[PDB]
Symmetry: D2
Subunit: 338 residues, 4 copies
């Protein structure tokens, strides 16, 4: 009756997701039963417990042997094969793979998990191609249980799309520009080193690094009305977690900063409760470590010019908040498992 | 015949300005003859030579005694009094004070230098009140030699205003929003500590810190047409120097990214040569250390949506590039010294 | 019954101390009744709650008005006067001042609190001059209840002295060298700026910075046998909290690494329980945030050469661990009050 | 006449080495003719020119096409094969490979270059197994021209061994402990991620990270008298380049700090000229970027206790200084070629 889950890629998102589930395990339809990763259970149990961002895991004991990670008695079988086609998904009765490696985001790549026997794959990133893309709180109720491969979009998409949805329905978004000032991630280089992206090649804790954001295209996938009407970039900066998106929209209905804030506040108390948090506090990025919302609107920073040019600024914990939404999407898939 | 200059406040800008002048001394109408600062000549000579950002000064020898800093034979008299009214400006025949403390930006405050005998004051920051404000390359030819107190605006203003001027004349700027992702400065706190600004209170090398930017108001002072039509914020991040401004404008004439770039490129080769640099390279903040331009347009990041919503992104060395412009303004004042 | 406490200087240590007390308040003989600081209660309440290192305080509500900071319904009266002679210690019935400003470490300075009406002062730093100095777990039982001004030494002294005491009693320390690789503190400069210490003047988050360590002299104060037999330095590095001391000792009784570790482990389970923690885990500085021990021996790093040359390495949370010891010392004084 | 060189692994050391050679190319017996690397010439030309640590290369033009990197009109042929056995060393007439990948440090690994047609290999790291190891200024004159694979040891070995040699000859080193407080390197992880070394797994720019130092064993290889008499560790800290070693020695001849400094100063002016620099200046790590010495003794930090316990502290630019020594060793081999 439980949906048996395997994590492919036990990295920042894979381990954040694991810790999210461990804390919510009592009210879950999911059971994490397997991990595939490039490393071994003892190393991965150590990293699961000792986290530079989340701190030491305290809720339960974490141990390992040659074959398993044990999280408070719960045994998670471990394997290590970079080729998903070889994975023991039928042998372990895996229902859902959390695809968190970053390297199987195409349908062809993610489908290797289906070939190995898994029933469904949830990619923790934008998909490449015609992969259904979901943002919880924006369009996840359109998920169809017949879909075998889905995308939870990116961290920035999950922060920006709920805000855009609210603003679009209140004021009509005609065009919108985004810039996320974003913590560095493991895709960037610690010191200057080769990378397909010549700026992500550059020492990440030393530099402001312009690059792409998945939200530039992904928001238009979860709000189809606005497809082609948004664009923007990322500026990676020397913080290890927590990000903030700056969104400037050309809107149809004239407004003022106060009304924009009130509209988002009301949504955060109703249709978007638990997805958008509304804050009037004068905080900084460290203060949002561990926040469960997809988006925290920083209301003091809202601006409007000429009625139609709206600026909003929203925080997000790109590791933990996004992993909470991966878990929410997986729970939703399990609730609607045909 | 030389304009005798005193530096008040031998900080990041005061010392960057000093090093700018030392490198351009052969073609200068200015002679730096005095320093007032909270510290002593030996400490300040050490900091002038050994700079964590600029490296070790190599062009000439820097030494000191109880009374003077010596920069390649050139003797700079030193004093240490926090109250400008007490300074020896008449006794030293000071013509121009470079006001770089951050604490005398009002007319009443800066005028204390005039009381002490200086003839003119150049504030290295936005002024408080009705202080004439200049950006070299935008409106500095409107300087009037009768003005005894002037402002060189802020680093962000000097980066953004030249770009805005070019865009406004080509496309007509109706409204514009700005966010500078900006290196931390000494006004921020190394660890959490009291500050009039509750976010600048927070550990600067640990945090993304939203705060004010002088450019939100100062661009409208140097381009009067756009007064009240621009607004925006700063996000201070954990880099020690070099900043980048993101500008999203609602424009009257529809355009596309290519045309925006070509317009700025042409200006950078003509009316704005030496003020705006045009770059098609995929660089990061470290690469712009020491750049002399007020603005470096990052052309690969230009975006337009719906013809009328324009996004441009420009780099600036907020210490060195700004200090080059302080020097340019002072040279201009000296050239027009009545 | 309660010893009434005022905090002078509501900085990193003042606020860490406050949070230590708030969490240990049920068994305490201390009542924090007053704060003097350069800032106002609203700013200081904000900083008490929102801490970049400790996270958001959530055990109890924290608020403020013009006169008080409120912590879980406990009203803490606030004043703001840089001269301790002016403080309302008589009117507020202050028994004990926690002197955490960094600028009243001499008897003449700290005694201004006594003139103002306090009965005793606990300096959160090495004293200047003849100030009785204590390290809990090393010599705090020698506390003389007639003393009116005492010192809790420094963070590094509290880490190193317990280990030195154990090693000296087991093996006989003849000489010892120390280097603490130490997080930066607020005494250092965010960007290059004047400082009495020409290296602490230098941008703290981008440099390794050699400087003094208070433990070089203070360990010999709390272990008088070893006066003049130890020396060392600090290397300040770009982490905001948690430090590690490297101690190389020349010992009389020849030993080997296994025996050194066994001796310290046994002490940590008995006479040094709660002061020294013994760890064989392969951890890094982030993992010791919030650790309550004065010293965490990193047993895997113990080395011995030739029988008599002993190297031990010990972690410490220089903000929180030290503040726990400040609280322990204040509680000891309150339990031995005269 | 020229010894034809190929760089294998165009990383931090590969590119620092290239830039060292480009600046010393007029007096060289080496010609860099080829590069093998995991990336392509256009990416690698970009990284060679735009360096976050060294700045923009401006001595000569740097460009690239599908097959070559061009440096000042010098065409450097490029290939990309992770297996050295496949490399075109015979066809390109490669005499000497600079082995800078980090993964061919054993004789079996490095010998794949010889199979491919190179005549000798210089490993830019300690060797694994019986690889002749050299430190310029310590034992490079012992070079045996018949050796086909050699090691230049590590950055810390090159800093520490010259100082150890001078101290041993003057005072007799009986035992010695070392700790290098060391910039992070590309072997560490930007965010917590799997690693054979559970501490190097941890986010490098936000942690103090204890780990191994190659100098613990390698100093005894280049000073055979001291084999087994030294030991130590590294503490990796959040700076991107420049490191400092702390060495505490037990010496036979009793001395004092003044005599230790005099002995090292004299060596730095004579037998160790260009290898050890002697400094009495109060500098920090940023100031030693680009320093050409293997070791900079920070004389102000020298301490002695009891005559026989000696502490010295020495800086080194672990990228650039080490690469200068790689170039020095390669030039020595080219001058003693057989
Ligand atoms: N970090 C964020 O803020 C964030 C937010 C939203 C989404 N995401 C997405 O989540 C994915 C993972 O990102 P991350 O930050 O967690 O990166 P990460 O820390 O590198 O995690 C990826 C993990 O997958 C492992 N791995 C790589 N290739 C594999 C393969 N073929 N088979 C099995 N395991 C493999 C990696 O091992 P190695 O370390 O040995 O390579 C690592 O353990 C990416 O798609 C990323 O874009 C990231
Ligand atoms: N840094 C930038 O990127 C930048 C760019 C453009 C403009 N500015 C503006 O330039 C000004 C200085 O900024 P900064 O970054 O150079 O700061 P800074 O490094 O703190 O420099 C200010 C200097 O003035 C000294 N000082 C303070 N009060 C004084 C007084 N009453 N009399 C004499 N000297 C006094 C300070 O001494 P202490 O260190 O002892 O306080 C310090 O040496 C501010 O207005 C700032 O907003 C800064
Ligand atoms: N941080 C550590 O790891 C550590 C560990 C052990 C001991 N200590 C010692 O503890 C003391 C404080 O260190 P810290 O790191 O907490 O420094 P800090 O963050 O600068 O805190 C000092 C506090 O005192 C305030 N202050 C300064 N002068 C004052 C005056 N005359 N009257 C009232 N308030 C005044 C400061 O205000 P402003 O911010 O306006 O100056 C600040 O709030 C020093 O003796 C330090 O060496 C520090
Ligand atoms: N950095 C220092 O301070 C320092 C000092 C002295 C000695 N060393 C030693 O020098 C070596 C390199 O260190 P580093 O810091 O320069 O490391 P790095 O930046 O990672 O450089 C290594 C280079 O080799 C490439 N590479 C790896 N495997 C390869 C293969 N099979 N064929 C071709 N190219 C390959 C890497 O590509 P990828 O980026 O794609 O992996 C990278 O370009 C190591 O032995 C290191 O211990 C380092
Ligand atoms: Mg199958
Ligand atoms: Mg006068």
């Amino acid at each position: 009756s439980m949906v048996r889950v395997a994590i492919n890629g036990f990295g920042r998102i894979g381990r954040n997701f694991m810790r999210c589930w461990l804390q919510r395990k009592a009210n879950s339809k999911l059971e994490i039963v397997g991990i595939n990763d490039t490393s071994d259970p003892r190393t991965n149990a150590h990293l699961l417990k000792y986290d530079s961002m989340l701190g030491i895991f305290q809720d339960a004991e974490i141990t390992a042997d040659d074959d398993c990670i044990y999280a408070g008695g719960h045994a998670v079988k471990c394997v290590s094969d970079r080729n998903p086609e070889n994975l023991p998904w039928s042998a372990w009765g895996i229902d859902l793979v959390i695809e968190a490696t970053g390297v199987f985001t195409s349908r062809e790549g993610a489908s290797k998990h289906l070939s190995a026997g898994a029933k469904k794959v949830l990619i923790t990133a934008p998909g490449k191609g015609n992969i259904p893309t979901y943002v919880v709180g924006v369009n996840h109720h359109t998920y169809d249980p017949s879909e075998d491969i889905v995308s939870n979009a990116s961290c920035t998409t999950n922060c920006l799309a709920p805000i855009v949805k609210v603003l679009h329905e209140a004021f009509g978004i005609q065009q919108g520009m985004m810039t996320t000032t974003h913590s560095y991630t493991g895709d960037q280089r610690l010191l200057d080193a080769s990378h397909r992206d010549l700026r992500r090649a550059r020492a990440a804790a030393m530099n402001i690094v312009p690059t792409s954001t998945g939200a530039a295209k992904a928001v238009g996938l979860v709000i189809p009305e606005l497809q082609g009407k948004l664009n923007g970039i990322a500026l990676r900066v020397p913080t290890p977690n927590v990000s903030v998106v700056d969104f400037v929209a050309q809107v149809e209905k004239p407004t003022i900063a106060e009304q924009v804030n009130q509209v988002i506040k009301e949504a955060s108390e109703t249709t978007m409760k638990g997805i958008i948090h509304y804050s009037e506090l004068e905080l900084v990025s460290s203060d949002y470590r561990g926040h469960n919302a997809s988006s925290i609107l920083d209301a003091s920073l809202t601006m409007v010019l000429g009625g139609n040019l709206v600026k909003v600024v929203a925080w997000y914990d790109n590791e933990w908040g996004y992993s909470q939404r991966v878990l929410d999407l997986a729970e939703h898939m399990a609730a609607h498992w045909a």
